[PDB]
Structure 1
């Protein structure tokens, strides 16, 4: 129950899972608290301690704005932080099988949340099930979000940008130096993440300082070429300056802006983040990754196109209705509490909410490519088109594009399409297979019989869990024992992908082919 690390001893705690035992180490620090002079700077390495750190409960989540649109609604609040917010939040968690494994493959989770929110503490990121069932070691970390994590005055080490990514990297570094003490193999480390976590995983494939800190990668509903993933260095500074004026810290010694922003309280920074953007959307990434010349040496589009990334296997996928969840956070005529049958004029208004700085012609082009109905009568037409618009543009087509381009340099890639609508979900049915609702299947929660889950859902989760583990351990996400559909390699030409559902696993080709030719070739030019 006590492990000696390079910076001191840590005491864990024991969990009973499925008649077995998992050892959990919740809240190990991996950096100096980024307080005081350290706010906005890269994470600094931890100086030794001499006691026994008690890693027996989740640590503080990092400071962040909370979604307040559906108070008391679990569909919404399952995503909000479940620990104290604090700037003192650079901690990670380790779940190891009991008894201690000998050379276990390691999975490192990176949460999403638009780079503005999120925490490793969430119920759906609980790694105890993967530890128990597949005898892998699961690690997850908190990393700074919002402006405290990604404020950028480029070149300036007081606010260089990408701090949250450097938090993640330092945690990967911690696993390299320390996980062998826990029974893990530092040579078999698979990163996985969802949404902005998935976009983070992809940027680690680009970043030269992460090359040697992991083996393989899994990207769930996200990647760095998504339109929200990378902030330009011009608008990044425009946003840093708008934050400065909004807080009274406008100086012209740029370093004096930072010192001034450092004497503010977290809440004062958090409440002005929303207004640095001229027009925002429910997908807005106010403060996110930038080309800082340190973590990220060039525009990631160019690195992807010219083959400049870690050469390894990737596992990539998306959900059937990525876009629906965002419609109820602003689109007119939409509500989780009715069937959201919108009219043509409502759809048009929705495009302005989701594509605010886009030309009238650009929005006509979206409407023209998504409103040629097979049947003109059905009243769902517009409601469904706007969901597909937001999901294809923001998630599915970037994920596909990334996989094509990545596979063209010779590495095995596997693509999935998650289309299971969970039996007992609190969101209405019209929202479908929503963004983030594969995560619980990946983490094995449906394996807990004890629950809301059907038997079909238990079997689906058990299969996904085996596929993810085989991918981590062996680079190949097959389930070999139960006469399962083989998962073909995804290649630039044939573009095969595997569907994930409770009924029929199927091999299909060329997901969203018509829609993504629009988003990937026509729409970037408007």
Structure 2
């Protein structure tokens, strides 16, 4: 119940899971609270305590704007913070099997949310099922988001950028120093994350400071080369300066700008985040990772291309309908409450929403490549084309290109295509297999028979959980016992991938080949 860590004792709590027990330590601090003069700085190391820290409830979530697009609606509100917001939010959680394991492999979760939102306490990130079923240790941390986590004046230690990535890194360090006391093996640590959390995982593969802090990596629906994931230094300074003007903090001393921003209340900073860009989209990442010369030593596309990254195994994948969720956050003619049949002209207006700074030629080229119909008279043609545009550009083609370029330097990579739509999905059926809705299967929520998933979903989640655990423990995402399809390595020539669904698991090749040639080779030119 009580574990001695290098900064003090912590008390956990026992949970009953599937006729067994899991010990949970919720809300262990891993850094000094980044308050006052510490706002916008890299996280500082923790000073010891002599009490017993009671880690028996989730801690505060980091300050963030909330999704208010659909009040009362579970599909959006399940992603909203479920603990108090506070700048005092640098805490982590640990789930361990009971009895205490001897040398357990460790899975560290990094949540997503566009680098502007998210928290480790969400129901769909509950690590107790993985600890119970696979006898791994699960760790998750809160990290700063939005301008409080990623505001940048590159070079200036008062606001250097990437602070939220250094939060993640300091939690990785905490696991290295402390997890053996919990029965974990610090030499067998796998990072996993989704969307911006997966982009974060991919940046830890690039950052020399993270290379000794983990073993292997899992990237669900994200990678740093996605178009939303990295902010240019030009964009970053324009956005910091715009925030200053919107808050009355414009100065000529850049350090004086930061000191003035340090006296604003968190809510004043949050209120102005959306407006630091002239044209926002549903995928806007107003404050995100930058090339800071510290966490990130060079433009990450260069590092990837030239093989400058941790050499290890990776597991990467995407969902069938990544793009559909974003359509109801601004595209005309779309609604979660009807079937969103749109016209050609609405499609064209939708491209303006999603590609505001793109030339007319660029937008025509998207239309040309996505509107060559198998049948001109299917009413859902344009609705489905816009979702695929958004998903292929923002998630699928960057994930495949990351996997290709990473595998070219000699490491085993495994790619999946998740195509099962949750029987409980609160969003409409036209949105299909949405962004974020593989997470509950990875965390084993359908293994709880009391919670209304189908039997086929229980079996799918059980197999995914085993494959993820075998990847973390052994570097190989096989399910070896139940006559399962073998998961081949992804190589840049054959490009084999595994489909995940309740019916038939299949080996396929060259996912989205035609679409990704457009996005990866042509579209970056316009």
Settle same-fold status: TM greater than 0.5.
yes
**Deviation, structure 1 residue 83:** 0.1
Deviations 1:173-203, CA, capped at 9 Å, x for gaps: 0000000000000000000000000000000
CA distance in 2, matches of 1:167, 1:349: 39
SS in 2 for 1:382: helix
Provide TM-score, normalisation by structure 1. Answer: 1.00
SS in 2 for 1:450: helix
Deviations 1:469-517, CA, capped at 9 Å, x for gaps: 0000000000000000000000000000000000000000000000000
CA distance in 2, matches of 1:409, 1:157: 35
Gaps spanning 5+ residues in structure 2: where? none
**Deviation, structure 1 residue 423:** 1.1
Aligned length: 526
CA distance in 1, matches of 2:175, 2:252: 41
CA distance in 2, matches of 1:252, 1:440: 49
**Deviation, structure 1 residue 424:** 1.9
Deviations 1:222-280, CA, capped at 9 Å, x for gaps: 00000000000011000000000000000010000000000000000000000001101
**Deviation, structure 1 residue 373:** 0.2
CA distance in 2, matches of 1:497, 1:254: 49
SS in 1 for 2:276: coil
**Deviation, structure 1 residue 451:** 1.2
**Deviation, structure 1 residue 285:** 0.3
CA distance in 2, matches of 1:511, 1:131: 33
Deviations 1:137-165, CA, capped at 9 Å, x for gaps: 00000000000000000100000000000
**Deviation, structure 1 residue 320:** 0.1
Deviations 1:200-222, CA, capped at 9 Å, x for gaps: 00000000000000000000000
Give the corresponding residue for 1:10: 10
CA distance in 2, matches of 1:243, 1:424: 41
Give the corresponding residue for 2:222: 222
Gaps spanning 5+ residues in structure 1: where? none
CA distance in 2, matches of 1:452, 1:291: 45
**Deviation, structure 1 residue 425:** 1.2
**Deviation, structure 1 residue 455:** 0.1
CA distance in 2, matches of 1:167, 1:423: 36
SS in 2 for 1:187: strand
Provide TM-score, normalisation by structure 2. Answer: 1.00
CA distance in 2, matches of 1:399, 1:51: 46
**Deviation, structure 1 residue 127:** 0.1
Give the corresponding residue for 2:315: 315
Give the corresponding residue for 1:25: 25
SS in 2 for 1:50: coil
CA distance in 1, matches of 2:423, 2:310: 39
Give the corresponding residue for 1:359: 359
**Deviation, structure 1 residue 290:** 0.2
Q: Structure 1 runs of 4+ off > 6 angstroms?
A: none
CA distance in 2, matches of 1:484, 1:478: 8
Give the corresponding residue for 2:410: 410
SS in 2 for 1:317: strand
CA distance in 2, matches of 1:43, 1:98: 32
